[PDB]
């Protein structure tokens, strides 16, 4: 999370894709930032300290896996919004708070 | 870093039979422990031709062979049905304990004295994350001047093994939260006492030492009542009381005699509190010498004593003939129960072996219509038969 | 029901379908104290460190850690976990002629 | 009722209500013993 | 505390907020400087050495 | 009687009144035996 002030790196866990013995829970991409940053939520608005990092008002940047990933898995899906997709091992997400936004 | 230096250096001045005997421990820890909670209950022969007895006795002289200089404060696991709780606090794969447990157990070890026997490793601080903790029961004990502690290595831990001749006396428990766990932590203490589990040359000796001028500061008109009483007195007496004679047939003699006997003990009672022994058959729990019953060769009839006798009020109007000394004889041998009263101070009763001419050896008596409080029992079996330990206290 | 699997103090069941921790032990989730402020937890039946870190769940879930330590980390699927690193601010050259 | 959940000899009704060290047993406080010097002490008893 | 001259300082253990599980006793600032410096109250006055 | 609060093999009776040494283990002083040498130790019970 690079506030432009600051920067908070996380790791959540995330299940292992082929073994059935890997009874990790399954979450999505909204609810990993949730957890990760302690963010409180406000009905769709999901505010940080005191900062919207919601899919609408941030800039999420990916690497070229991850971004496949996501992009493959918007399809086979509805509601194509990126936290609905659901936290695969190795992801790199990047969320960019913008300088100016209104 | 303390115990494990101490500890390592106790590896070292230990005799070489001692050293066997701690690592010989290591491997029958189960084993050597229950000989040595039930070694004094066999004949002589029995005993020195076992060949556990020779480690057993060297691991009891390395024990003692370092008594500690002040108290110190002991922390081990126990079972509830040690204390005859012979229902479950809560299965070690739950993690509360209910009020009623609680409120059931704080019932049942509130008021007994609970002797112990043999070796136990106990450790010096509270159990943390990493230790094994199978039993919901922690005991708090405090061990006092002058007991043996032997700090050994299992390759990475320190263990204190202690060697038990103490009673544990409850004092309060509470429920405790352990790692999201709910265990029991019980404050114990001591109530010491003397017992002569196979070494009965001290019994006899001290005995011998205690009351032999009890013999000659009294009356001689009971003395001549005893004297009767040794050779087939005590037989008519146990014929006549024990059928609750005073209250329903005034034997006025015999009455007589047994009030001129029972004023002959109160000159100087017991000295000290002593754990005395008794062999007992089938029939002082109203039974017959092959009840069914009796074939306490599966443990559910021993539940059935235990529900029977287990925590009760036993009272024998009789003059109760009972020994000093565990160790089997003959002239009784199958009487599978043993009462192993707790004789405290203050108890009216006197040494009937100090009087030359008397058969019983290592023999005490004390009052009629005495009260005993059956605190726990337990088993231990002789070649194939189930011979049943009862462990009480006389409160008279 | 109660069977711990992995061993660390929170059954299976409340493992998988949501737990939470009261008076230092784990109960089975309510919706209803949500408002009261309690979370919903959520870990692996079969592993006793879910995350990966030195904590297990209960270790996590319960607070009974480093204080210093955030309280996201008290999730036992968010991992506590440093990233450290160093910057430099200025350097001197001693040149010794 | 008493029961020690932290487990550090203090009862949870004494640690929340308010107690103090008497010859080196925790007892419930008495607002009589104020002026005899004793200090009540809470804290948490988790 | 900085008398002047000496100065004390102190850490006094305050409750979370959101923690539900959080069971620190809460107490005021005027309860928490007088716990924490030793001072004597006489009513409205909290004394600290004579100051 | 014979309490030890503090567990240093002295009871509290004889550590507030006041107590000496015979034969390693301490006795309830009598000022009888200050003559033969003996001297008056007190300590605290806690
Ligand atoms: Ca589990
Ligand atoms: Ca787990
Ligand atoms: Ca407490
Ligand atoms: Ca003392």
Redesign the interface.
């Known amino acids: 999370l690079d506030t432009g002030s600051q920067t908070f790196?996380?790791?959540?866990?995330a299940k292992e894709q082929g073994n059935p013995?890997?009874?990790?829970?399954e979450?999505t991409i909204g609810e990993?930032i949730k957890?990760?940053?302690?963010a409180t939520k406000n009905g769709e608005l999901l505010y940080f300290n005191g900062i919207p990092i919601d899919e609408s008002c941030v800039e999420l940047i990916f690497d070229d896996n991850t971004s496949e990933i996501i992009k493959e898995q918007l399809k086979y899906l509805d509601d194509k919004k990126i936290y609905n997709v659901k936290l695969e091992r190795g992801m790199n997400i990047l969320i960019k708070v913008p300088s100016y936004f209104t | 870093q303390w115990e494990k230096k101490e500890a390592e250096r106790v590896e070292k001045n230990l005799d070489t039979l001692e050293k066997e005997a701690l690592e010989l421990y290591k491997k029958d820890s189960e084993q050597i422990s229950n000989y040595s909670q039930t070694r004094q209950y066999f004949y002589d022969y029995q005993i020195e031709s076992n060949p556990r007895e020779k480690e057993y006795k060297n691991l009891r002289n390395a024990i003692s062979k370092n008594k500690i200089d002040k108290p110190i404060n002991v922390y081990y696991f126990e079972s509830p049905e040690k204390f005859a709780f012979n229902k479950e606090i809560r299965?070690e794969?739950?993690?509360?304990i209910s009020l009623e447990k609680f409120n059931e157990l704080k019932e049942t070890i509130q008021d007994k004295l609970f002797k112990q026997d043999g070796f136990k490793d106990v450790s010096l601080y509270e159990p943390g994350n990493g230790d094994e903790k199978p039993t919901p029961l922690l005991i708090h004990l405090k061990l006092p001047k002058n007991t043996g502690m032997l700090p050994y290595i299992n390759s990475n831990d320190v263990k204190t093994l202690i060697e038990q001749d103490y009673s544990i006396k409850i004092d309060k428990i509470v429920r405790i939260?352990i790692?999201?766990?709910?265990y029991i932590k019980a404050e114990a203490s001591i109530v010491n006492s003397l017992d002569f589990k196979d070494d009965v040359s001290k019994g006899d000796l001290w005995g011998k030492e205690n009351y032999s001028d009890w013999s000659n500061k009294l009356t001689p008109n009971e003395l001549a009542d005893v004297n009767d009483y040794m050779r087939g007195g005590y037989t008519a007496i146990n014929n006549y009381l024990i059928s609750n004679g005073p209250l329903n047939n005034p034997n006025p003699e015999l009455d007589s005699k047994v009030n001129n006997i029972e004023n002959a003990l109160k000159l100087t009672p017991i000295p000290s509190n002593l754990i005395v022994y008794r062999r007992s058959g089938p029939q002082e729990f109203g039974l017959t010498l092959t009840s069914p019953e009796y074939d306490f060769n599966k443990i559910e009839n021993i539940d059935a004593f235990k529900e029977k006798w287990e925590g009760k009020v036993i009272t024998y109007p009789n003059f109760i003939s009972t020994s000093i000394g565990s160790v089997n004889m003959s002239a009784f041998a199958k009487r599978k129960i043993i009462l192993r009263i707790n004789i405290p101070k203050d108890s009216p009763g006197a040494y009937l072996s100090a009087i030359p001419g008397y058969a019983g050896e290592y023999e005490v008596l004390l009052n009629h219509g005495s009260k005993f409080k059956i605190n726990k029992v337990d088993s231990y079996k002789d070649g194939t038969v189930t011979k049943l330990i009862l462990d009480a206290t006389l409160i008279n | 029901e109660?069977?711990?699997t992995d061993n660390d103090?929170?059954?299976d069941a409340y493992e998988?379908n949501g737990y939470t921790?009261?008076?230092?032990?784990?109960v089975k989730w309510n919706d209803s104290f949500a408002e009261?402020?309690?979370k919903k937890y959520?870990?692996?039946?079969?592993?006793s460190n879910?995350?990966?870190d030195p904590y297990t769940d209960?270790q996590k879930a319960?607070?009974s850690i480093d204080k210093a330590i955030?309280?996201?980390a008290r999730?036992?699927?968010?991992?506590a976990?440093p990233?450290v690193g160093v910057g430099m601010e200025n350097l001197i050259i001693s040149t010794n002629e």
């Open positions: 790196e996380r790791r959540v866990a013995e890997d009874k990790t829970p979450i990993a957890k990760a940053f302690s | 299965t794969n739950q993690n509360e939260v790692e999201g766990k709910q | 109660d069977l711990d103090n929170i059954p998988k921790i009261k008076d230092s032990i784990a009261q402020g309690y959520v870990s692996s039946y079969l592993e879910t995350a990966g209960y319960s607070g955030k309280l996201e999730d036992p699927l968010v991992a976990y990233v």
